[PDB]
Amino acid sequence: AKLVCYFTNWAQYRQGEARFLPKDLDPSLCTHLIYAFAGMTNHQLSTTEWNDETLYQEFNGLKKMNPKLKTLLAIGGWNFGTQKFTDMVATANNRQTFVNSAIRFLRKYSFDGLDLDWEYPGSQGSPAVDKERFTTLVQDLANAFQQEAQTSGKERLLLSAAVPAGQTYVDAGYEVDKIAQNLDFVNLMAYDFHGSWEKVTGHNSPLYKRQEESGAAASLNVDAAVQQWLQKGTPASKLILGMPTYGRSFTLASSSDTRVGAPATGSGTPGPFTKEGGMLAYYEVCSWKGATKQRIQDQKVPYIFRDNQWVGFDDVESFKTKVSYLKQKGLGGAMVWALDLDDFAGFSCNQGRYPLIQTLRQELSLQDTFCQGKADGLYPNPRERSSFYSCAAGRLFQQSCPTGLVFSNSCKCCTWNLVPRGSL
């Protein structure tokens, strides 16, 4: 299982106890750490913060304490917008300039791969052609990453992508089946489903639909987003379920109507640290005094309200529920946005350091010719213990075992690993 955690390079600017600094990084907490963000200049990869180069060394320096730990560098995000992606992907030459710069940059700074965070191909200013050109970008990077690994001798650079949960964005920019074959893993942004852009209270990251929802709204939830990415061609083993360590906040029309779906007049009051109306870090919500917390029964996530302020957020219970679901669906693990929004310093929630992300950590720990002319049956994955190959009429399929089970040829099944006999 993977635990993919995002680092943000502007969290160093928050005040007081919310300030996230190099010491706050825990190299043992996640399996993959991703640096948000890099930007782009003249179609080449570039820093976005005056001290990025210093931060890169601290960041990848984490691998000396944990050398299982892999690191990636993310490009794009909210602030980046789209136009630079659009200009880079348009011509095969511009794409080339980027891909080469990318490889140079990542080796130069000790990153193990690249995470694409374009928001989004085919949306906002991005033209319809950017959908297929994004496929081409992903292909090119996968190509050039593969050849660098032969030539250089070292391990191939990883390639991942952070992908939207909304069908409108997915349809407009993502050829799912294609890109999924090239991406090492797929970071599903299963949050921002509801927020203060809408006129009524809604949860940021609900697990299931509410009984009363219909139309498009019925798919604005984690389960529908997961099935969407599965049905459209993503292997479960590559689908990483994003979790948010922030909630989204509303100002209610009336303090007497606090239901999910209650009229809201706009964003909730900015948090003392994040200072962005409409959202709150977990550390800003977890210890609200004199508030009333409730759980949404159908959606398995909590909300909290106090006077005219209402916030939907994720807690320890909901992260556990989401990991159960995740494993029940055979997903490749969990992704989290973001490290600096969890109570990383244990100063607020009285739950220790990283209570949300630790919850994920704990709960996560509980060819094309090969199958011919084989008979129908199961075969092991020579490169992997918890995966296997099924042959069906000459055709190969790759499946994974349930979490905490291994493939044994003796039962042609996934089962328990062999038991020790009073060993060291």
Author numbering: 22 to 387, 416 to 473
Authors' account:
Chitinases [EC 3.2.1.14] are glycoside hydrolases (GH) that catalyze the hydrolytic degradation of chitin. Chitotriosidase-1 (CHIT1) and acidic mammalian chitinase (AMCase) are the only active human chitinases. They are composed of a GH18 catalytic domain linked by a hinge to a CBM14 ChBD. CHIT1 is involved in the innate immune response against chitin-containing pathogens and is also produced by macrophages and neutrophils.
Here, we report the crystal structure of CHIT1-FL at 1.95 Å resolution, including its CBM14 domain, determined with an adapted crystallization approach combining cross-seeding and micro-seeding screening cycles. Four disconnected domains appear in the AU: two differently oriented catalytic domains (Ala22-Leu386) and two ChBDs (Asn417-Asn466), corresponding to two CHIT1-FL monomers. The hinge region, consisting of 31 residues is a Proline-rich region (9 Proline residues among 31) linking the catalytic domain to the ChBD, could not be modeled due to a lack of interpretable electron density. The observation of remarkably high B-factors for ChBDCHIT1 (from 26 Å2 to ~80 Å2) in comparison to the B-factors for CHIT1-CAT domain (~30 Å2) reinforces the idea of the high ChBD mobility mediated by the flexible hinge. The structure of the catalytic domain, which adopts the conserved (α/β)8 TIM barrel fold found in all GH18 family, is essentially the same as the already described CHIT1-CAT. The structure of ChBDCHIT1 reveals an elongated conformation (dimensions 60 x 17 x 14 Å), which is different from the globular and compact conformation of ChBDs from bacteria and plants belonging to CBM5/12 and CBM18 respectively. The ChBDCHIT1 fold consists of a distorted β-sandwich composed of two β-sheets containing three N-terminal anti-parallel β-strands (β1, β2, β3; residues 427–428, 436–440, 445–449) and two C-terminal anti-parallel β-strands (β4, β5; 455–457, 460–464). Moreover, ChBDCHIT1 contains 6 cysteine residues forming three disulfide bonds, as confirmed by our electron density map. Taken together, we propose that Trp465 plays a key role in the binding of the ChBDCHIT1 to the chitinous crystalline surface probably assisted by the presence of other aromatic residues in the core of ChBDCHIT1 that increase the overall hydrophobic character of this domain thus increasing the affinity for the crystalline chitin. One face is mostly neutral with a negatively charged spot spanning two residues (Ser439, Asp425), while the second face is highly positively charged mainly due to the presence of four basic residues (Arg444, Arg434, Lys423 and Lys461).
